[PDB]
């Protein structure tokens, strides 16, 4: 998926949660 | 120059706290800060004074805290004359004219329990003593002479006897290109006094001429060194120690002794084909033979000599004690290997080191009173290892391990992996270990029997940061002792940052001393907010008793 | 085994004659860097010499921080973590400016009962750390030459 898997803990954008 | 924004705090040691700072802009290079600090549980106002200065001699900071009376202190100490508390701090550092070096690091407190009750801004509750150091040095390209004074205020009531070198003179002279050799001379003159009036007092004069032959090459290097140590001890006030100790100190002692060292290093390179092409692997063998003859030293009191840790860098050190009171004999060979990985841009991506020390004969001093688990004396005894992997630009992983067969167990071990996108965005895990056997071997005798030191160290720490919308920053830290299965330190911080103001709210729970009546730790809570006129993540991460350190 | 002895110099050939520049030329870090450059055959020129077609190495800020790595069961410090950070710059003349850094970690246990002795140990640790900050700086010289191409 993403190059950085740590985006799921902090990415903002749309949280989609 | 005017009033700042009053911040507030609630702690279990002081209850409600209030600060009312006032900033005085004296000059462009000088300023001061006067802060009345109301404490409700102690029921008074402590006056805090900052004074920052910049001058020709360097930059300096002075702090003076004074509390005229203390209800809590007088309740705990009803028989004392007065309950005043105070702190004096002075930190000066400067180099004038590129040759004069001025250093001052002075801390003095009224009582040993000052930092357990008060704000840890220029001290900490984790500190076991206060340092009082003055230093004036003259340094040029081939010579330096430093006069320094060292004193310590020990907080522990078990034993406050601490030695201090009131004068201390250090003189280094260097002379390169004396034919094929490089020469150096080191001189020292020190005077050791003690707070107690019955302990031995001493004066020491040390001289150390060394000459080395280095031979370098594209793939290897060999360095030979011959050193000479000449020490004169003149110690008086020995009636007490000679009266109650079987071994007798002598008033005059002359210790003259050579040292021979031979260090060698090699570099091998290969191209990493199985991994991604363009990466180069370097294998670096290193060896060191060290010979130091044995001289009996039971007649010299140990003033400033302590055991040194043996990491991988410390395996190749030529000294096993600090200072000059204890100089163990050595007939040793040290062997180590370091492997390094390089990417296509010639950037070090990985390195691993392992080494050991083989003793051909027992290392003696004449005062060998170290508690060893077994009776190992010769052979391959000390092992060390380090690793540092830069997994990517945002990941990093350091680790280190120390093994001593005389302890019959791993002595110390540390590891940590950190993710750091940037200063506002990071996560770190770390682990620190120190076996009970090593605590027994290296620390004081009462450490091995005290409940709060005997078990050693087994600590796991986690730190995290999380910014929200480029206006909020949440930082957290949690440290856990696995031997006791209990918390050591926890921290939370939330800072809302705006164009003109920033509001910070913090929380910490920390180990804050021991209770001998029930034999358990005492914890402290603190919730405070301050307003100021970056997101402040790094400042929040430095606010606990186990501050965050960058690891990449 | 595919290994072979390192046929290339530790310091690049273009950086064999170079200028050492710093704001504290008599400091311990400058002495350590000059010493390590002297082992590697580097010819150090004065900063005021007329020979301008040589790379320059400008030492920058040096920071040493001592903190509490771990604490005992009563909150007292057990391990002291000393961290040294050094920032330096390499000026390739007429080409570019390349920042470099060196960060060194060391640790030691505290002992108030022999605090003076521990203080001496701390000084010795600092005297090693500068050397560890010297070898790291020259070790990043090949990266600058690689980056220059
Ligand atoms: C908590 C205990 C466990 C701790 C360990 C957790 C895992 C630690 C390893 C995580 C790093 C590897 O995971 C991933 O690897 C890839 C593969 O190169 C690298 O990922 C990289 O990909 C490319 C470069 O190749 C870059 O564009 C990207 O930005 C970068 O992330 C990083 O290294 C990391 O994103
Ligand atoms: C880890 C295991 C131990 C590894 C250690 C291995 C030993 C060290 C290997 C490096 C040897 C350095 O040896 C290197 O030899 C060359 C060639 O003789 C010397 O070269 C120089 O001196 C020689 C005389 O000796 C003359 O010919 C001339 O002046 C010049 O060539 C270098 O001054 C020296 O640096
Ligand atoms: C060769 C290069 C090495 C690079 C670094 C590799 C090691 C990196 C750090 C390793 C960290 C783990 O550290 C490890 O912690 C465990 C957990 O208690 C210690 O273990 C110790 O206590 C446990 C239980 O408490 C006992 O069962 C065990 O016998 C004892 O050794 C190990 O002695 C130590 O080695
Ligand atoms: C890195 C990645 O794959 N994503 C996917 N997203 C969701 O699953 C919601 C979008 N996203 C963020 O919002 C940070 C990142």
Residue numbers in the entry:
A (entry chain C): 1 to 17
B (entry chain A): 226 to 758, 766 to 784
C (entry chain B): 999 to 1147
Tell me, in the authors' exact words, what the paper reports.
The outer-membrane associated β-barrel is made up of 26 antiparallel β-strands (β1−β26). These β-strands are connected by turns on the periplasmic side and extended loops on the extracellular face that fold over the lumen of the barrel and require rearrangement to allow LPS molecules to reach the external surface.
Binding modes were described by cryo-EM, resulting in 8 high-resolution models of SfLptDE in complex with Bicycle molecules at 4 different binding sites. The binding site of Compound 13 on SfLptD (near the periplasmic side of β-sheets 20–22) contains residue Arg691 (highlighted in red in Figure C). R691 is highlighted in red in (C) as this is the site of one of the 3 sequence variants between E. coli LptD and SfLptD. Charged residues on the Bicycle molecules were typically found facing away from the protein. Overall, the backbone of SfLptDE showed little rearrangement upon Bicycle molecule binding compared to the apo conformation.
